[PDB]
Design a protein around this ligand. Structure first.
Ligand code: U1H
Length: 330
């Protein structure tokens, strides 16, 4: 089997991407944030605290003839940005663009943090990292990809995020018309439960490529590109007026600037992020200072190849017995 679904940016800045997911019987369509950095499929629901729901589409398990409460199961997750959510669990039929999983764990939120409440476009998340990170207690649950894997024509999923435009998530196949050149595959460590790989280096604009190992995770659930301070300082030093602002919480630059591109290495291959992709608009409404798309990972503990980097590539999340990552220009 295969599955294919369109992913759409939630706003004019590509702050996040949403993909329609059918849950239950009859189908209840919710727009979830596909996240290769986490492993919980959680949704806003009829159980979510009323004051914490503001515009989101909810999952109502009582209206689904295939929903079953997973006895005694609870979940609670905290994301790297400080956001959190928790609740109870149901098993139900979940479909993504033609691909169906019966008995998928659908984590129903009873509580969500302010940032989720404030994002009316995100109805929940669909975790695509390794099932070792799933927070369901006392019995850990599998991801949608993990549950569908054996049925897929190929044990893979692909991420093809658009820049200010719709994109695609494919399951079980590689669309050879969606990229240029070839796909370069690289080794993955699953030790931290993430799609963790090692970039071979970088370049700033038309500058000399620096060969250096950058260990990081391929994370669709993170908006920006988080890299070592040395790297990020080398990037912003090419932008006149750019500075690291402690009050804003990162590198900012004059909105009138035309940004240089950023190239990252995948083996001997190169992925070029165009300069416009690193512009995240005014720091506050009407400000002439803009927020940068490349930020330091110094306070995180890990480098994050988020949407800024992934949307420049056709990305293969290879779930073969030894998982790997594939990147191609597009
Ligand atoms: N990295 C996962 C993630 C996804 C969405 C959000 C937000 F912004 F919707 F709250 C936070 C964290």
């Amino acid at each position: 089997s295969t599955g294919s679904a369109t992913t759409t940016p939630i706003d004019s800045l590509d702050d996040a991407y949403i993909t329609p997911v059918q849950i239950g019987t009859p189908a209840q369509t919710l727009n979830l944030d596909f996240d290769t950095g986490s492993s919980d499929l959680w949704v806003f629901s009829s159980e979510t605290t009323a004051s914490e729901v503001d515009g989101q589409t909810i999952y109502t398990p009582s209206k689904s003839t295939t929903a079953k409460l997973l006895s005694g199961a609870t979940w609670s997750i905290s994301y790297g940005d400080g956001s959190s959510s928790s609740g109870d669990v149901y098993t139900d039929t979940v479909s993504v663009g033609g691909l169906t999983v019966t008995g998928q764990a659908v984590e129903s939120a009873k509580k969500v943090s302010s940032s989720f409440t404030e994002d009316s476009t995100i109805d929940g998340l669909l975790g695509l990292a390794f099932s070792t990170l799933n927070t369901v207690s006392p019995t850990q649950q599998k991801t949608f990809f993990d549950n569908a894997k054996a049925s897929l024509d190929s044990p893979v999923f692909t991420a093809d995020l658009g820049y200010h435009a719709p994109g695609t998530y494919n399951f079980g196949f590689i669309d050879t018309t969606a990229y240029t050149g070839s796909i370069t595959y690289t080794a993955v460590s699953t030790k931290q439960g993430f799609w963790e790989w090692t970039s071979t280096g970088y370049a700033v604009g038309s500058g000399t490529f620096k060969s250096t190992s950058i260990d990081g995770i391929a994370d669709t659930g993170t908006t920006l590109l988080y890299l070592p301070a040395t790297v990020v300082s080398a990037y912003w030093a090419q932008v006149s007026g750019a500075k690291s602002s402690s009050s804003v919480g990162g590198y900012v630059f004059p909105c009138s600037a035309t940004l240089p591109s950023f190239t990252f290495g995948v083996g001997s291959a190169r992925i070029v992020i165009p300069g416009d992709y690193i512009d995240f608009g005014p720091i506050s409404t009407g400000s002439s200072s803009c927020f940068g798309g490349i930020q330091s990972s110094a306070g995180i503990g890990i480098n994050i190849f988020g949407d800024v980097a992934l949307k420049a590539a056709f990305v293969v999340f290879n779930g073969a017995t030894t998982p790997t990552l594939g990147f191609a220009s597009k």
